[PDB]
Amino acid sequence: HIKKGDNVKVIAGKDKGKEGKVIATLPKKDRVVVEGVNIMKKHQKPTPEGGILETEAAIHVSNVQLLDPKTNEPTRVGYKFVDGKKVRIAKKSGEEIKSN
RNA sequence: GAGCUGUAAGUAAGCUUUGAUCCAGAGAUUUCCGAAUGGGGAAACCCAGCAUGAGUUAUGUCAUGUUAUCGAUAUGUGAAUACAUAGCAUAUCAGAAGGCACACCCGGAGAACUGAAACAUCUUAGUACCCGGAGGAAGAGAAAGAAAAUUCGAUUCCCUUAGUAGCGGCGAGCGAAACGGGAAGAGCCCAAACCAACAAGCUUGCUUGUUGGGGUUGUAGGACACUCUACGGAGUUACAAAGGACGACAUUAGACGAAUCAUCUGGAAAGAUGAAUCAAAGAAGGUAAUAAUCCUGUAGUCGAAAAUGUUGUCUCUCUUGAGUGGAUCCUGAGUACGACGGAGCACGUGAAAUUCCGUCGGAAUCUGGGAGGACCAUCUCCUAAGGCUAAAUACUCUCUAGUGACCGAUAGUGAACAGUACCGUGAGGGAAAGGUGAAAAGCACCCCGGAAGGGGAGUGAAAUAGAACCUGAAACCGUGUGCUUACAAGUAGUCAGAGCCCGUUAAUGGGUGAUGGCGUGCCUUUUGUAGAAUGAACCGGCGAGUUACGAUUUGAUGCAAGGUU
RNA sequence: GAGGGUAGCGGAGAAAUUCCAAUCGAACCUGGAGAUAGCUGGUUCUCUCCGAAAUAGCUUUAGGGCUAGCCUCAAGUGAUGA
RNA sequence: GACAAUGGUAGGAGAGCGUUCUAAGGGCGUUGAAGCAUGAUCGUAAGGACAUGUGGAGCGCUUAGAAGUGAGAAUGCCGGUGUGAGUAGCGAAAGACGGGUGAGAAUCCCGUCCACCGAUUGACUAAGGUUUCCAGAGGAAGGCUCGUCCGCUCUGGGUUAGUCGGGUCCUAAGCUGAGGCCGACAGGCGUAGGCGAUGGAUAACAGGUUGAUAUUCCUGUACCACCUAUAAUCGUUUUAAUCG
RNA sequence: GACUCGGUGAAAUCAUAGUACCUGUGAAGAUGCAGGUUACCCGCGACAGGACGGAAAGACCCCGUGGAGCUUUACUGUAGCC
Ligand SMILES: [Mg+2]
């Protein structure tokens, strides 16, 4: 489960192996947007004259994995209660720095 | 615990880590109509009285309360009539009224088509429909019983008895019960004798009334007579009733939750190939193809501020129990029964006992009364004419969790997008209509054209996936061609056969057809159909011996004087 | 002309079986209800073996039914068949 | 191996083909499943393969089990598409020409001439309908042809009351009806009283003005109810003026 | 109106049709059968002899132990009345 500012890795699709970072979330369809991944080309009409534009489209969230902060490998995520508050762990190391 | 302002996409303007949107519990607000209730009315509107209040020099206006009819409880008053009464008035209370899944239950009233190869007794059937009353169940229920043993011991339901006994234009048909095996199990309160009080007549004797206590039954019990005895038991599901404490579970939101990498093909891998790992988890669904190890989850474990629902332990609240005498007193009256007319009991009034309704008659009192299928005698069993009662049983418009050798868009609900289009004055009847792609990346720009449409370019793995969007059959409509046809008489094929054109699942091949022989569609129904007898415009989809319970016979299999529940 | 009344086992009729929502020897709608139909129509893949009847008798029977005759399958007996 | 048999309707008997689903086993599939199309293939029949094109994610085989298990006919039910056929019809009637607009004009707009109704094809008010009304834009469908037009599509607008017609007034027929009478239930009737116009009562006229309203808006001049002030007349409130 | 040209454009019906006549034959009145006799291929305007032409599961007739309305000294009841 990934937040808005993390640094992830793509594990499925055309762009498998790229890193990028998250910029949008869309939780109702569970599809994130990652920079430089899944780029599309739109035909926009004049609204100024338009033309072909390139932006990123959303990818399904289960095609993305976080990176172990220490060893820098993909990992799943668990939870832990500290100070009576929930944090994220890397299933291969300790705490996971996710402030922004 | 990071996004959010419905389906619902946009833009704008905003909200949110000082915790939003979202989920559960509890509150607040809740226009008008509708039983509709201040009066009226063509529902969703019109018109008022009274009391407060705002406003106005004052009217008009506005705001908030209250005002139906029956019923209950008080008070006052009182007609024909003197007292009285019927009424009348005022004030408190809020008892009824309407609706439903009203499926199942209990009552009132109650058909016909049909079967009997016609039809009337009978049957369909106490069924459909209509009306009333209710509950989570209702009804029944504690022997005036069943029986004929050496008896049993409230009611209801299941299996058997058994398609037996019986009933029946003895026709068609209708059709039990006791015994036996089980589920469940529970018993109680009055009326009366009597006693103690209070009260009115009365003459203080009696009568009657009110409260309380007592007391409840059959091999007779209780009153009375007498002799032996006391707070432990009981309880809100009947048996009398209220309410507190502290607990324990279960709902109604949730939380944590093990383990995988690489290459090949490809738009994309979960597939193939290779090497690993978890398992109290290899249920399931998603993810760009088919995943135990990517996501949501699963096995397992944890969790409640608040409100409900159960359930314990205290509290609480009630309350003596035996024996002998047995026939002095009490023990349910217009009742039980009878006659006449009907109905219900499996039973058609009959050998009809047994049980109810209408109209008339009308008992007995323990040496009593009732039943044991007319009646009599003896035996046996019971004790009517007052009431209450859980469980085992029936149903599903709903809610929660699941299941299927159930359907897959003409199917499955009428309805996957609707009791809506539409039809009818009305009651009422009642459709058709699912699928782009993995992702909108939904075709910038150029050209012809008023536009609609199109050709390029571009997106995409694919655009003969372009929104009339998965696949895209047949009828039907066209364009181009290889062979053939303007002297010919036809159910349109078949057998023989030159010429011309091609070249296959490669075998004594394929297309066309000058000319010759033979040849009156199909189905149904008939003695007999080319029939001028019936049916079909054509193509597609849909459309007719099934299932339950009995009987009989055959095959198979197990055991055998036994077999089987 | 407007506002009203009479309703199907019924109403209305200067009378015709006449009218009661383009329908009347008994309106329309929903239910009993899949009424009943000894009558007509229909009833869906293939091959192999055998193969009738259109007649007695009774029948509120005559284009229906029942028993017998004639077909088929299985087992049995054994000259009973032509 | 020898010998024999083998037409067939009602109808009896036997052996099989194919469809959907389930169980167990064993397989195939993005190097392309089902479906669809074509072929000169195999089996005694129902039927089974293989190859190529299209298609884009599921499906066979073996043994056994279970059935909504097979269509050419029912004046069958639903959908689609033909034939008749470029055929019948295009719903009472008088138009002609010039100019305009437009991609496009017999059919739209403007003008002149001609024609038809005129106890009416003219002008008012009711029922009934319910936005059809007006302006700007449009031309896919509707309009029995056409269309630049429209009662059609889109966007935005439009209905003004003390006196007009209803209510805050009255009653007819009829309908309801507190108490009441009757009735298996449901309910039927009816007294006082209510409701109910098609009738009775009841105060406003002339002119101006919009694309769309007018006795309603504006100007002028009126009338009718009700309330408060300013007042002559008011004189126990019997009476008196007053009201009743 | 019909007929020719421009616009628009249905319907009943329909087993498939390359659909002649005569004398016969035949379920006894033939475009489809036999033996002959006629006839080059394709339209348009007209006529009504045949296709037992279309339309409506004959209303006449008979049958069904089918319905309904009406009558009476048919059978059985019954509202009422005495
Ligand atoms: Mg064609």
Whole-number Å distance between alpha carbons of A95 and A98: 9
Reading the block at residue A61, the tokens are: 């969230």
φ and ψ of A59, to 5 deg: -115, 150
Chain B nucleotides close to protein (CB under 7 A) are 1-4, 255-261, 267-270, 286-288, 291, 294-296, 439, 441-445, 458-460
Experimentally determined by: cryo-EM
> Residue A81 Cα, ligand 1 centroid: separation in angstroms?
80
CB A31 within 8 A of CB A84: no
All protein residues with a CB under 7 A from any atom of strand B: A 1, 3-4, 11-14, 16, 25-28, 30, 38, 40-46, 49-52, 57-58, 60-63, 65, 74, 76-79, 86, 91
Q: What angle do CA A50, A15, A12 make, to 5 degrees?
A: 130
Q: Which residues of A8-18 are buried (b: 16+ CB within 10 A; e: fewer)?
A: bbbeeeebeee
Query: What is the stated resolution of the deposited model, in angstroms?
Result: 2.5
